[PDB]
């Protein structure tokens, strides 16, 4: 729980507990007992909805797909949806197991195949690579139940990179890849239907659990433009001859006059 | 009054604050419980762990900022740079001393932050990865040169806007990072001691830049009654507890 308010009477001190210095890079220790005369207040309030396990462990939508010809394909990434991407980019390194719930409006018999990295995924339904001996696969009927499975921490590191300031190739290379694109791939999920009846919309709701967040970062103050890319200059119109202008898409609102709000 | 000595070098200051120790941890050596590679790492310990002072940048009026990637900036600085070019992996803490002093007639501020994994944005538009040459400028750093719609976009140029920290996250929230402010009214220097921050024990020091020291002129440089309109900023970076493993040929061209 949060600390209680301590009582404080009138104080005439020579060491001020309210004159600090912003330049030292340390935040203030100032409580309300320094500035005013407080009373005792029993504070039973908690921040148990603000820890990383409760802040991030909520089952956000990570990706949408649409079955075109009884087939969908989604590579596992938190990068297509901006609301979970902002919450992950609060931090630099995140180590989490993830449970994956599939919400499909298809009626019939579906198959998910978690293709691990390094092999060819099935390029269609009725493909031969759906018949696999070792690729973990999930058969389910979407009526009477949603499927759910935990993918553990598959990292090649102690944590996932939310941000990477590096490249996968040395200096002389030409197809260099900035960012977190080469550092980790969580496989992909290949969807197919063995029936035909219902709809085509497949939603993938992924919940991070057993989370360990490692370096805090500023929350993003601009809308995302691409994925794996951290850009924020939105190029809105490609056709018309205002093409090379770039919107900013930030959230800082303006007030008409300071000292009047 | 302050004094920081790492071998064959010494930093001295007069009007200095508390030293910032980044995330409460000192730079350490890689423990055997946290190591992955099998070979014995090297430990230079006196000729690499020393204060290398980079080139001075000029804080004029209209200067938007500078940034130096680490350990990219020390790639030609002494035997730390030679051990970086000759080894497959490496880890290092850093002690970053930033010096800018003008007068009691000058005004201004400098937020001096150390960003782990400063993945810079593209300068704008299409889905283009930023270049290797533009995020590895050496000890010369990168003058931030301000936002404009007329900025060059040829070949993965990095973002030039200091307000969005050139990755889209707002300045002023940059104080979540290990930082200090050089306010010329009160102090003139800023020492930040950073441990090795990575989710991996050692990595290639040329491909990956772990830290990125960023200096932004928060408040402009007023000269006051004095005809000096621009004051140099010098950045003195010392590796600390640097180790390297997997020796190999020099990774130059």
């Amino acid at each position: 729980v949060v600390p209680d308010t301590k009582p404080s009477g009138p104080q005439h001190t020579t060491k001020p507990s309210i004159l600090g210095a912003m330049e030292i890079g340390a935040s203030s220790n100032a409580t309300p007992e320094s500035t005013i005369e407080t009373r005792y207040v029993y504070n039973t309030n908690t921040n148990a909805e603000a820890d990383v396990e409760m802040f991030l462990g909520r089952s956000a939508l990570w990706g949408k797909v649409t079955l075109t010809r009884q087939y969908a394909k989604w590579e596992i990434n938190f990068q297509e949806q901006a609301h979970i991407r902002k919450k992950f980019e609060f931090f630099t390194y995140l180590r989490f197991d993830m449970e994956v719930t599939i919400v499909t409006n298809n009626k019939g018999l579906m198959q998910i195949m978690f293709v691990p990295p390094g092999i060819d995924h099935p390029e269609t339904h009725d493909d031969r690579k759906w018949d696999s001996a070792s690729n973990p696969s999930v058969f389910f009927q979407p009526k009477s139940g949603f499927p759910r499975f935990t993918i553990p921490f598959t990292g090649l590191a102690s944590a996932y990179y939310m941000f990477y300031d590096g490249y996968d190739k040395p200096k002389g290379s030409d197809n260099n890849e900035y960012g977190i694109a080469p550092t980790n791939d969580m496989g992909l999920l290949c969807f197919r239907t063995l029936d035909n009846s219902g709809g085509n919309d497949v939603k993938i709701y992924v919940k991070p659990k057993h989370i360990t967040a490692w370096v805090p970062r500023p929350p993003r103050a601009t809308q995302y433009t691409h994925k794996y890319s951290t850009n924020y200059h939105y190029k809105p119109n490609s056709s018309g001859p205002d093409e090379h202008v770039l919107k900013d898409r930030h959230f800082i609102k303006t007030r008409p006059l300071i000292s009047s709000a | 009054l302050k004094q920081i000595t790492i071998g064959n070098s010494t930093i001295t200051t007069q009007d200095s604050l508390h030293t910032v120790l980044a995330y409460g941890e000192w730079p350490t050596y890689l423990s055997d419980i946290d190591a992955t590679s099998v070979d014995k790492p090297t430990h230079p310990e006196t000729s690499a762990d020393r204060f290398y002072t980079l080139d001075s940048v000029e804080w004029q009026v209209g200067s938007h900022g500078w940034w130096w990637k680490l350990p990219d900036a020390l790639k030609d600085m002494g035997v730390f740079g030679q051990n970086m070019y000759y080894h497959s992996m490496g880890r290092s803490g850093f002690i970053i001393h930033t010096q800018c002093n003008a007068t009691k007639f000058h005004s201004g501020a400098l937020i001096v932050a150390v960003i782990p994994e400063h993945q810079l944005a593209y300068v704008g538009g299409v889905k283009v990865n930023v270049g290797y040459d533009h995020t590895h400028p050496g000890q010369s750093g990168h003058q931030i040169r301000g936002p404009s719609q007329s900025n060059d976009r040829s070949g993965g140029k990095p973002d030039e806007d200091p307000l969005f920290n050139c990755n889209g996250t707002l300045l002023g929230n940059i104080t979540i990072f290990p930082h200090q402010i050089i306010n010329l009214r009160t102090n003139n220097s800023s020492t930040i001691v950073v441990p090795y921050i990575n989710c991996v024990p050692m990595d290639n020091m040329l491909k990956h830049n772990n830290l990125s020291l960023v200096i932004i002129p928060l408040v402009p440089l007023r000269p006051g009654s004095s005809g000096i309109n621009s004051v140099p900023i010098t950045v003195t970076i010392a590796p600390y507890k640097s180790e390297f493993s997997g020796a190999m040929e020099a990774q130059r061209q």
Binding site: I24, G25, A26, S27, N29, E53, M54, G57, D97, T150, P152, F153, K209, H210, P216 | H18, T19, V20, L21, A22, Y23, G24, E25, I176, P178, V193
Partner: peptide, 25 residues
Amino acid sequence: NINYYKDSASSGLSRDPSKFTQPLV
């Protein structure tokens, strides 16, 4: 508190400020 799947990853959600706000020496 039962683990119905006999795996550590299969469980539910699991459970100091001064490294920030005062990172001094």
